Design a protein around this ligand. Structure first.
Ligand SMILES: NC(=O)c1cc(CC[C@H](O)C(=O)O)c[n+]([C@@H]2O[C@H](COP(=O)(O)OP(=O)([O-])OC[C@H]3O[C@@H](n4cnc5c(N)ncnc54)[C@H](O)[C@@H]3O)[C@@H](O)[C@H]2O)c1
Ligand SMILES: NC(=O)c1cc(CC[C@H](O)C(=O)O)c[n+]([C@@H]2O[C@H](COP(=O)(O)OP(=O)([O-])OC[C@H]3O[C@@H](n4cnc5c(N)ncnc54)[C@H](O)[C@@H]3O)[C@@H](O)[C@H]2O)c1
Ligand SMILES: NC(=O)c1cc(CC[C@H](O)C(=O)O)c[n+]([C@@H]2O[C@H](COP(=O)(O)OP(=O)([O-])OC[C@H]3O[C@@H](n4cnc5c(N)ncnc54)[C@H](O)[C@@H]3O)[C@@H](O)[C@H]2O)c1
Ligand SMILES: NC(=O)c1cc(CC[C@H](O)C(=O)O)c[n+]([C@@H]2O[C@H](COP(=O)(O)OP(=O)([O-])OC[C@H]3O[C@@H](n4cnc5c(N)ncnc54)[C@H](O)[C@@H]3O)[C@@H](O)[C@H]2O)c1
Lengths: 333, 333, 333, 333
């Protein structure tokens, strides 16, 4: 005796430490923490890693997390800095303080961005080269193909995000306005993230999956009520809230948590978020952008292709084009 | 037809909006949000309210929360400002940006504090005069009896908090050092919150509830390993992390969430946190301070009284005394 | 000292025992237990009651439940027999071993049924006359209005059930056949429970809420694949499985759990299950039957009215009629 | 177009079906289903398998399970019969209708048992030779070493079970009698399963982890209250309930669910259940029996060794011995 309490390490199997799984966030900050909580809270960690190019906040941030320890069931969580540890993995996510611009049109850029994302990513990928990446930063499209490309494997590893978010916005208010329920009810959006963001009025329905078109009778902008105004307001909704920002995070992260949950577990479900644009609804070049799709086991398997074709089609279509158009030039690390 | 979709309000019961339950936070900020997440996340809202003497953050803060909406199941959450709405309730909690001092000994004060807590509390209590209050702010003791008193009903409504926190700290590290498990294992602390914080080595055990005293053989400070150093470090642990603060929140709130969960549901369990000090282990006057106890349905029912009596007894005992001693004077709204 | 451990009952508030809420099952058996598990498991008990006109199974049944105790968080669960205790409530459910007939068309009857349900119900209602009742037994319609009527309050208290079940059946297989996801995807059924059960092909869609009609092109029975055969098989699906029965229960109860969850919490959502048939889609007399609707706080608030009108309309319509037609006579306690 | 809806299989990664994980039950029946529910309900399936030497119940049983489908999130569950599929795994459990004897002392046997377990096990092990086995059947000890042995790897793969169960029994009643809480409070048992089952009064405590010995003052059987009678009753408690049995299952399975949860995730915690008896508290030969221990990642890592030594020591000690003594002969496939 001596060592402490009965037995000593071995006694059965032995020295090792095998999670099976594992995950991580490069948003140890707001989105990070928001993410962390949702994640540390829901139910997902067989093993979890957290980290950034920060030494301080890290120390402090984890302390609250680590301490909570006994309130949530997640045995292990590592903190440190560079990109060695995290390896043990599957799902990894990076933000990188730059984000928006604080005003309007999500970061047209990639320019000084290439830098910010790169020295972080190519590190993580090597260590757990066998994972999928959730890339967030304004124009999700832009980076998804940026990350995917420099990173490693088209539609298997690269998942942007967006959409689910806009839908939520689209849905709650409207629903509430309509006069209904949180859970059921339905209808989507297509494309990017503000300054275009195009909705589908072709399927908007209520706790049926019947039709609100036959009823409230079509037209948008020639009726007052203002269906049109509704979706615009929303874009604004995503927009202004300039007074308070990292609460974009609360929900943002929440959404991401939902996605990861969705992706991590393998539900074969459905979620927007920009991946490939090659199902069989031809799109002008590399393409890139959203479209409702289903995620699982390794990343995604199948996107859902279609719509009416009344300008909205173009609305959706043209946006992607116009930017790459100019991006062509702007793009080049 | 016209109104929209089939039926119209009535059809069954009718006009009303009856949660059954309900709750709230005056920490719409850090602790607030930290709290909010844990809460909005775990599983507790049949109906939820959030608010402060803030107009802005509020707007922004809720947006992320409200939007998440579809990711968590909590039908309704109200934002607004003063203290009318929230009424619908049971559990309510207030922080109030003042908190610490950023350096060491938790806010000796109450002075300019009386103000900060009062114009908030006496409002809420009237509207949902039928609730229990979780008061947090450095010297939990100090305010619990302050809130309780001006507020309404001794050991039925006033619950400080502390302890569980210190235990967690006490436990994880130690356990890890020991070489064991997150969940089982055990041993407590008594008193206040730093600069005394006294532990019980009289019951510290491991996944048995047997004894580590018989083994690692007693003494503290005459052995090197440094059991003593261990608990001190912890106090420091709670202490320094001055680089990053609101992560005190992450865990702080987490803990509070645990408590509320515990209290809200009615588990008849056990949790430190300062209430009455009159079980039958006589304490010098009004008294106030912690001691492991059991919470339920309306607040608490029963505290757990006891220890060895070797100076530690005094350690615990004397602290409370010395402050009231001086507080006597300092106390008086 | 003496009594045991520190303090004694009072010390704060005092003698009382106040859940806030509470619920119960008269299917202490299969459905009962199935129900119990789902319920004891998910997250719903602030306070729970279970009981029947059984003394034995009760004793035994609860033991496993009660013992699990420490694995799930549900402080209290009472067993006993008659109908005094349970009072403390909101949601109560009765089955009553008679159920089917073991062969085909769900219990045409009510005859010897009136008896089986009555001596149980009018008891419970008085004690917790302030609740809502989930009545299950073949022809849900039949009894809902039977229970509701003798019981107390039309569309406020009486909720049959059915539908969600048929949808599930409708959906999984089909979806799987289609080649898709568990969660998203959609389309419903209307009416009763087998031997008619009419689906809506007018809204069947996939992870869009777009349209599968425009595509797989209409017709049913003039195409081979056999959309038609599909829904029939399902009815059969509900049907045969005569080899094993109480697994109808597993899912049955699961479904009921989903419903109650839905109802208990107040989600303002959507769920079939037969209530009132008076939205504003006139139905021949008392009426009774399903139709997707939204449940909440006290029972239901609003049903969703509509369809195409191609025979299917009649299909749905006529069934209800024909039975009441004959029921008229058969009905009379 | 034609196939149905947009895109076709590939589009990203491709043809494959990779869970990551997976699990199974050979108690498709009572314990099985009880297990299934707890499991299908809590949160554990990235991928799940269920099966037995039954064709019928299987068909029926799964139907309820499969249908529930949309109520719980567990994408895939396979049914079929022999032992090919399940392979994909980690944790597997077998019961095998024989179980008790319906009267008293848990199945002294192994005799006709060897048969019942063998033709099932050696099948599963080959396919997912990389797992851990939860063996249940009266004398857990007996089979654990039986399964382990013929099966494959001592203390790495073989986990009996028992104990947690007895503790629960020990705890609830007592606690309730005491007058306290579901969650906190503590004290254990050692050995086997009835007709000896020896408790530790050396650590029995209350929401402290302090001491009830110093207080209610020692002795058992020389005091009336009847601490002694208490634990006996319990054994009886496990015993009689002969009127109703498979509710032993409800809890039994629940407990097993708790264990698996514990084991599956890797909490490094603590749980009785018989494994190795070689920590360093020497036990007469092969040994076998319980003792509180910690489970994780691959099975278990470390058991907790100790007690007083007053006859109880012998009580515990001797039982194991006496049976092997005779078993020696009886043992031999
Ligand atoms: N996907 C979305 O929906 C989304 C939305 C929004 C807001 C508007 C949105 O469209 C909506 O409709 O609601 C924003 N974002 C993106 O989220 C990122 C996170 O933003 P944040 O909350 O501001 O995180 P942060 O504070 O920038 O970063 C904090 C931590 O980041 C690390 N960090 C900071 N700088 C750097 C660096 N140079 N290198 C490495 N790490 C760091 C450090 O660990 C910090 O503590 C954001 O991208 C936003 O656009 C996404
Ligand atoms: N109970 C604890 O364990 C605890 C610990 C700690 C840190 C150290 C701790 O002992 C430990 O060991 O970990 C701190 N606290 C207390 O938590 C309070 C919350 O701190 P916070 O995260 O800093 O919240 P905040 O930012 O002060 O407040 C933000 C919001 O508060 C409102 N607010 C601010 N000022 C005022 C006002 N004058 N009136 C009304 N509302 C506001 C507004 O809504 C803000 O958005 C803190 O008290 C700390 O001591 C408790
Ligand atoms: N709502 C449904 O979907 C549903 C479906 C089905 C099967 C087919 C279905 O349409 C489907 O598509 O899947 C059946 N049911 C109804 O569920 C009831 C429960 O059936 P069960 O599992 O058979 O419960 P039980 O064994 O009859 O009853 C066991 C306990 O009932 C009590 N009990 C028994 N007899 C009496 C009595 N005379 N008075 C009071 N209590 C009892 C005792 O406590 C028993 O232990 C069933 O109604 C079925 O039709 C509903
Ligand atoms: N670990 C425990 O705590 C435990 C306790 C108890 C009761 C007393 C207990 O000590 C206590 O304190 O509460 C019992 N058990 C063991 O659980 C086993 C399950 O019992 P069950 O609920 O009776 O399952 P079952 O009905 O026997 O089996 C049903 C299915 O088993 C398969 N099956 C049946 N026979 C055979 C076969 N010959 N080969 C293969 N499969 C099957 C088929 O799929 C059935 O549908 C039980 O072992 C009990 O002792 C464990």
């Amino acid at each position: 005796a001596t060592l402490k309490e009965k037995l000593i390490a071995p006694v059965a199997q032995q020295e090792t430490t095998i999670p099976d799984n594992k995950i991580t966030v490069v948003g140890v900050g707001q989105v990070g923490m928001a993410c962390a909580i949702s994640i540390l809270g829901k139910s997902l960690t067989d093993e979890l890693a957290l980290v950034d190019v920060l030494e301080d906040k890290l120390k402090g941030e984890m302390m609250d997390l680590q301490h909570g320890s006994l309130f949530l069931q997640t045995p292990k969580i590592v903190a440190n800095k560079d990109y060695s540890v995290t390896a043990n993995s599957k799902i990894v996510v990076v933000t990188a303080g730059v984000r928006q611009q604080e005003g309007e049109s999500r970061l047209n850029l990639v320019q000084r961005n290439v830098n910010v994302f790169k020295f972080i990513i190519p590190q993580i990928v090597k260590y757990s080269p066998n994972c999928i990446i959730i890339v967030v930063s304004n124009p999700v499209d832009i980076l998804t193909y940026v990350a995917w490309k420099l990173s490693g494997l088209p539609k298997h590893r690269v998942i942007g995000s967006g959409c689910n978010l806009d839908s939520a916005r689209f849905r709650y208010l409207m629903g509430e306005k309509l006069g209904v329920h949180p859970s059921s009810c339905h209808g989507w959006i297509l494309g990017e993230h503000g300054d275009s963001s195009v909705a589908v009025w072709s399927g908007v329905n209520v706790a049926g999956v019947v039709l609100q078109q036959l009823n409230p009778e079509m037209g948008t902008d020639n009726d007052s009520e203002n269906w049109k105004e509704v979706h615009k307001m929303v874009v604004e909704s995503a927009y202004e809230v300039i007074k308070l920002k990292g609460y974009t995070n609360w929900a943002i992260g929440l959404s991401v948590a939902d996605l990861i949950e969705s992706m991590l577990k393998n539900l074969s479900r459905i979620h927007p978020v920009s991946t490939m644009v090659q199902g069989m609804y031809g799109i002008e070049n590399e393409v890139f952008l959203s479209l409702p799709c289903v995620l699982n086991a390794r990343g995604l398997t199948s996107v859902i292709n279609q719509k009416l074709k009344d300008d909205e089609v173009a609305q959706l279509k043209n946006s992607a084009d116009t930017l790459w158009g100019i991006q062509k030039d702007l793009k080049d690390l």
